Design a binder for these strands. Structure first.
Lengths: 241, 127, 172
RNA sequence: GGUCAGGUCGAGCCCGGGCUCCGUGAGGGGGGAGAAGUCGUAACAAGGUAACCGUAGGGGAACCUACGGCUCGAUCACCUCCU
RNA sequence: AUUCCGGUUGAUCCUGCCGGAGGCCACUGCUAUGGGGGUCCGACUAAGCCAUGCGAGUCAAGGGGGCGUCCCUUCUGGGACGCCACCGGCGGACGGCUCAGUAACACGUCGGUAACCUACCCUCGGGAGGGGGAUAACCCCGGGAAACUGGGGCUAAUCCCCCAUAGGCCUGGGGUACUGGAAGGUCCCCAGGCCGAAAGGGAGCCGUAAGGCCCGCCCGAGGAUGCGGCGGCGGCCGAUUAGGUAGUUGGUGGGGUAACGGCCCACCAAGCCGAAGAUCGGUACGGGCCGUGAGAGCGGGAGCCCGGAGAUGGACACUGAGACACGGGUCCAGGCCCUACGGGGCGCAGCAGGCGCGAAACCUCCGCAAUGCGGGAAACCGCGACGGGGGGACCCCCAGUGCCGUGCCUCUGGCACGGCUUUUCCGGAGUGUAAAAAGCUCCGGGAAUAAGGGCUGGGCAAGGCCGGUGGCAGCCGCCGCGGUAAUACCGGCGGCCCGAGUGGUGGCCACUAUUAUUGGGCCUAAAGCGGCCGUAGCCGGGCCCGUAAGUCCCUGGCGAAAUCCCACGGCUCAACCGUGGG
């Protein structure tokens, strides 16, 4: 290969989209964008398969273009687009709102939450670094970015909760993670769980960094700091298998 | 131009590594160009493969010559005396990153690559 | 494959078995018997494996296998993995379409339904089964009626007379 | 784009050597088969010369002799074991 | 799901080979594969080459027109579609095919580039001010059988450029603030140097033009995606291959690259590598898996998915984030074809199809409709990529070839004869076509109507007789059988097996503890070295103590999907596929 694959195959389409893998031979490959191709949920799958509102890709493309979905506050029109994890997907035309969440199974599920929560998108930022004018800027794994501060120490190192107002692309209500805060686990093999952090202590040097948590049941889990994602003091609800 | 890479010569055991394949364009190196001492600078603007624009020198005349707080000048050079990479290059008046030169008003030591940087800077010696 | 052909296939002892059962369960080919033998054999292999291993294999799986045997009727009410091991290849010949329609007595003998099933006159659930090797649940016994009928859409047809002569039921 | 000086990438052709495989050649050696021909009678009983062996020379051939070993050795082979 | 039999002999026991019985995979004979479902087909040949069709384009909503036509109007005049060439932009590096070479940091897994780039795309921030300018189209015109080619006047655009607004990059000195596991990348000031940003839109809608929906461009940062790079471990055979090496191992400076690097270079040194098998010859894409086997193990790399490699053989650059480029160019070698003989054009180990080869493998089909993708606001265009049917002893699965009375024989059955229902088959109906087909299925008429092949001395004791012939002709996998009452020949008859298959040959795995780890041996069956010595290596009495390397336990990161099992569901059914669990 000497070039981006423009075609994805059906036998190369995973079980995590919960798709029939012998259906044709070609699967919908999003164009590069926020998220990974196999860790995304296609716009084709959401209109066509999920809801029955299309019975051909022409139906679903025409339907998206006229409008039946806005993702993050802004317009889309083709079915090629990698929808991220911890995103906000909207049906304005039905008034449904979903979160893109893992199961224990590790398949992407759209989990319904109320119209209220569509406004919110929790960010836990990917890195934090200086840009010119001596201002630091916020980053994400869906590329969702904001600029402008005064530099300095600021709210956290990188483990944040932000409340994000999605039509405005604004940040509001900043909040640290603590040793009494909430995390939902959204990578690793311990996914779908939502609990209270016991302590954020870790193995102090080298590449491994552990963070540990307990829950409502109170099971003890260990996951990377990168695979800890701070919901807040809870903003979205749990994902169910 | 300069076929690389270049991991298909000999094994450190006296053996022969054969890795059957023909080169990539990205991996391949160019032929050297030589930066000459002149009264003028001769420059041309190329764009290297990657999508980065690089200033080519091919003759040169600057050495921009820094003090102890690094305050430069625009001043003209003369002959390369002492070239410690290859002593042959001092003669034929070719600048290097380790080069040591004559400049009008003092001697100095070249500290810049003239190939890709497109400018040659230098910091005065006490010599 | 659902064909089982043993290590020694023209031995005296196998051959006797086979010859005797041919209107005792209905054959017209050996293969049909081989399907049933393969279903049982795989079930007993799995049952053996789980019992062998410690409790550290996940009990959910042993629960799902045992469930299927309650419906099918091989373990009717039994709930024991050791009980699967003891099973005969004669308890799955008795759950054949041809020996469960004759049990109720809608088929004169097992031999009779080798043109009822072709011509489509024996229904189970909502559909005409066409297959002697079809295996019938305890659920499935509660709906055995007829459809797309021509000799049972005409009592006046002598077909109706040959099948039912004072009503020959059970299994033989 | 012209022509040419200096440097690098650089096939194709030619020349010689190295390595490795395949085809093949008068003539020559043995092998497995064949049916019938030819000589001897060696081995198997002790086969009428007990046999083997290493080494050395010789024989038409099976073989023979010398020396040392061995018996998986003949024999009632009787210092002795064996008798 | 773990099995043995014939054969060394007069008989016996051991040892040991051979043959056969099982699964699987080619090919080959007969017959058949009705009907129906899923897989599959130069797959162990010449990685041989091709006639002919075809796999690569697309925007006029960027753009001023040329032609036909439309709405008009029948004017001025503005609104459309097709067709047409030029710059723009994007795909053409992908998708598709093959696996020759390569035994290696090819590939897998974990690591890791803080050494490196990344356009289209996606995000957030900000920018697009002014000036300059062209060439097709059109008009006119020469040649070549052709390929192909032209010279000029005019001229549009998101056309091509410069400058500024800056930003970028280098370099010297000061210092903080973000990120880190650290090294230290990112901040800012300053000096001197260079390069020196950008472009817009028609009929509509939003804004005043720009701009935006839409399409695209610029700069800063990020993301995604692709490329390159480093390490741990795993990474074939022959020792009738034992010593190998001169950018070769290292140091120092440097060039060049996107970039680390003896990659390349100068200098300086003489190191580096090896018996836990170097080097050399030879063979081989690797992996998930698959085949077999109770396991251990053995065997394998095929459809299919993943990564790399190739595209007549070799060499070479340009444009692009991305090619040294599979239907592009330059050139050399071989070979083909056209030819006014001056001079041109190519590459089915891409797809149909052809031809050669051999033991072996398809229609010059149907469609762009669905699937994926590029461009386009969309409509829609392009697509032998693709969806499907055709053909094919290629595999698998399912199913039918009857049933009853019934005199009498071989009564787990058969045949005569009688009666009944009735797969194909006809007419009709849906399907489906996205227009065919595949014709089944359903309903009405309506028949017992597609069944063959092998074996019959012992192994398979599973299945027996007659006649001819007489150690013949022949049969044979093995042991054998025929020299005249032949179960073995040949023909006939009968029976037994299995069933759309049966049987044969070739190969692989089990049987084979004939590779011994599970699970083999060495007085005499094959096997103890003539004996010692001591090196490498292997192995170590009792008691204690330190380490916790080996060794056991627990948690957590992870070992792609598919393949496999179990469960349930759907298709009459099942194979199969979905889904969940393992």
């Amino acid at each position: 290969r000497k070039g981006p694959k423009r075609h994805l195959k059906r036998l190369a389409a995973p079980t995590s989209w919960y798709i029939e893998r012998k259906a044709y031979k070609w699967a919908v490959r999003p164009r590069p964008g926020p998220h990974n191709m196999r860790t995304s949920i296609p716009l084709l799958y959401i209109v066509r398969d999920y809801l029955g509102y299309a019975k051909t890709a022409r139906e679903a493309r025409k339907i998206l273009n006229e409008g039946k979905f806005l993702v993050d506050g802004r317009v889309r029109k083709d079915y090629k687009f990698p929808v991220g994890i911890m995103d906000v997907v909207s049906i304005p035309e039905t008034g449904e709102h979903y979160r893109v969440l893992p199961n224990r199974i590790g398949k992407l599920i759209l989990h319904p939450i109320s119209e209220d929560e569509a406004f919110i998108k929790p960010l836990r930022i990917r890195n934090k670094r200086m840009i010119k004018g001596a201002r630091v800027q916020l980053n994400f794994h869906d590329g969702t970015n904001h600029i402008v501060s005064i530099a300095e120490k600021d709210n956290y190192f990188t483990s944040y909760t932000v409340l994000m107002k999605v039509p405005e692309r604004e940040i509001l209500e900043v909040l640290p993670f603590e040793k009494g805060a909430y995390v939902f686990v959204t990578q690793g093999k311990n996914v779908a769980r939502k609990g209270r952090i016991v302590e954020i202590k870790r193995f102090p040097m080298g590449w491994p960094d552990v963070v540990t948590i307990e829950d409502e049941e109170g099971e003890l889990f260990d996951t990377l700091k990168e695979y800890a994602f701070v919901v807040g003091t809870d903003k979205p609800k749990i994902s169910l298998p | 131009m300069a076929i690389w890479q270049g991991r298909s010569l000999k094994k450190p055991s006296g053996g022969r590594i054969v890795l059957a394949r023909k080169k990539r364009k990205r991996e391949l190196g160019r032929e050297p160009s030589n930066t000459r001492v002149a009264e003028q600078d001769k420059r041309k603007i190329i764009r290297t493969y990657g999508g980065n624009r690089k200033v080519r020198l091919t003759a040169a005349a600057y050495a921009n010559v820094f003090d102890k707080s690094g305050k430069g000048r625009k001043v003209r050079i003369i002959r390369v005396i002492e070239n410690p990479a290859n002593r042959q290059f001092a003669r034929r008046n070719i600048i290097t990153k380790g080069a040591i030169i004559e400049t009008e008003i003092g001697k100095a030591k070249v500290t810049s690559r003239p190939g890709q940087d497109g400018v040659v800077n230098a910091i005065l010696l006490e010599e | 494959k659902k064909y089982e052909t043993p290590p020694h296939p023209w031995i005296k002892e196998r051959l006797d078995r086979e010859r005797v059962l041919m209107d005792k369960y209905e054959l017209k080919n050996k293969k049909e018997l081989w399907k049933h033998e393969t279903q049982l054999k795989n079930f007993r292999r799995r049952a053996r494996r789980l019992l062998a291993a410690r409790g550290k294999q996940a009990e959910i799986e042993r629960e799902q296998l045992l469930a299927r045997l309650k419906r099918l009727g091989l373990l009717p009410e039994d709930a024991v993995l050791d009980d699967v091991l003891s099973l005969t290849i004669e308890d799955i010949l008795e759950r054949r379409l041809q020996t469960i329609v004759y049990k109720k007595g809608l088929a004169r003998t097992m031999r009779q339904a080798r043109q009822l099933i072709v011509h489509g006159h024996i229904e189970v659930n909502g559909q005409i089964i066409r297959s002697p090797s079809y295996l019938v649940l305890k659920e499935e016994e509660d709906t055995i009626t007829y459809a797309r009928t021509s000799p049972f859409a005409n009592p006046q047809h002598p077909e109706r007379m040959m099948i039912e002569k004072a009503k020959q039921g059970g299994e033989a």
